[PDB]
């Protein structure tokens, strides 16, 4: 069985900068990840599938990478709006898959 | 306009039974393989079941296996979860999402190794307390 761990699962940041998160696996996954972004009172959106591929009507400034069992996912110069919780979810076995545990970043 | 709603769920003492509906409004229900994924506060999501379009195949995860059961109907378009034998550890909130990738090609040339997208509606989640 497959399971991945986010690090941090909370990281402080002031809006303007660059932040990049991280996604380890157990086991080698291959390319098979996704990127979910979840905002309270409003519904999930997909940021990044293939492990590396911008979702249509995503702005330029998300990036993922990686490959093999260690992803990185990158925001450049996040502001007011990108201030959510991220996962990163995988499906080597699809339609099965499971998820990660999140990542909450907010302000200093 | 590519929504999905949730009904059902509240309080509710072990050792009892739900069931849990989730109904489509405009797109489509008859080509698009459908999820329930489920959150317990202070953690993160879990999927917890995965049907097809057709309901040629059912998964569940091994937490919920067994006491669980999903289903569909396509002319009324909607997705319905059934769930015995409660348990104090199954109080979360629950939602229903829709999968990018249409479901009779996603094997022949649609193949999901190369062209899946990943779940481009949710929903919004009942809460369910045990
Ligand atoms: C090879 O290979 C390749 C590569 O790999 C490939 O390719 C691929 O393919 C695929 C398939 O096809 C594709 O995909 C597709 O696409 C399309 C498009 O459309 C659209 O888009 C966009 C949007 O997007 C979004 O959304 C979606 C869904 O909807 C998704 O999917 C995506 O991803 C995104 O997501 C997002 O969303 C949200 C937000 O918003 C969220 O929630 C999420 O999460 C995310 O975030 C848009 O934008 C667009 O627009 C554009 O374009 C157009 C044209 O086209 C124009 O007109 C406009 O204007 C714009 O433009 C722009 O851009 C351009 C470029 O493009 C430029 O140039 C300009 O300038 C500008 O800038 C459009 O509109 C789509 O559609 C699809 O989807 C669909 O389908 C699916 C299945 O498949 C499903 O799932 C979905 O849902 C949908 O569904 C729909 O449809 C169907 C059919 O028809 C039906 O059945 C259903 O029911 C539905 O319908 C409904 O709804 C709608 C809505 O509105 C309405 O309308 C109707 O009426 C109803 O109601 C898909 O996605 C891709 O893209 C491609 N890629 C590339 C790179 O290219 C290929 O394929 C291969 N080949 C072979 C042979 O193999
Ligand atoms: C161009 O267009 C052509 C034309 O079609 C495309 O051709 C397609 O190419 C792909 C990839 O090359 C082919 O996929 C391969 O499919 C085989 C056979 O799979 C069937 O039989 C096995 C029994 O041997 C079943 O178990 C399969 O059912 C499982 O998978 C399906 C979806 O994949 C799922 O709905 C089922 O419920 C079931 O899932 C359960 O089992 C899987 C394990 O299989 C498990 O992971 C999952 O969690 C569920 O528990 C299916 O009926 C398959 O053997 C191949 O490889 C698989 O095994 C290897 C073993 O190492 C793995 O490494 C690999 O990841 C796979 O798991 C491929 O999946 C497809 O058949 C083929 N289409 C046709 C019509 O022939 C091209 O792809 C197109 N090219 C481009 C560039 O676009
Ligand atoms: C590509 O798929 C093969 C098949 O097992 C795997 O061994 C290899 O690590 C994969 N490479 C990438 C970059 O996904």
């Known amino acids: 069985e497959i399971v991945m761990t986010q690090s941090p699962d909370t990281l402080s940041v002031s809006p303007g900068e660059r932040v990049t998160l991280s996604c380890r696996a157990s086991q080698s996954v291959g390319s098979n990840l996704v990127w979910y972004q979840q905002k309270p009172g409003q519904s999930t959106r997909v940021l990044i599938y293939?492990?590396?591929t911008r979702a249509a009507t995503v702005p330029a400034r998300f990036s993922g990478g990686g490959s093999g069992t260690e992803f990185t996912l990158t925001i450049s110069s996040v502001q007011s709006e990108d201030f959510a919780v991220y996962y990163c979810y995988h499906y080597n076995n699809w339609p099965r898959g499971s998820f990660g545990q999140g990542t909450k970043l907010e302000i200093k | 306009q590519m929504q999905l709603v949730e009904s059902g769920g509240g309080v509710v003492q072990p050792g009892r039974s739900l069931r849990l509906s989730c109904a489509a409004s405009?797109?489509?229900?008859?080509?698009?393989?459908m999820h329930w994924v489920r959150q317990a506060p202070g953690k993160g999501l879990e999927w917890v079941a995965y049907?097809?379009?057709?309901?040629?195949?059912?998964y569940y995860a091994d937490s919920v296996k067994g006491r669980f059961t999903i289903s569909r109907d396509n002319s009324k378009s909607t997705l319905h979860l059934q769930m015995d034998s409660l348990r104090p550890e199954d109080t979360a909130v629950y939602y229903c999402?829709?999968?990018?990738?249409?479901?009779?090609?996603?094997?022949?040339?649609?193949?999901?190794?190369?062209?899946?997208?990943?779940?481009?509606?949710w929903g919004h989640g009942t809460t369910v307390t045990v």
């Open positions: 293939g492990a590396s």
């Open positions: 049907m097809s379009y057709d309901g040629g195949d059912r």
């Open positions: 405009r797109f489509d229900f008859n080509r698009f393989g």
């Open positions: 999402a829709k999968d990018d990738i249409l479901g009779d090609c996603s094997t022949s040339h649609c193949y999901w190794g190369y062209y899946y997208q990943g779940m481009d509606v």
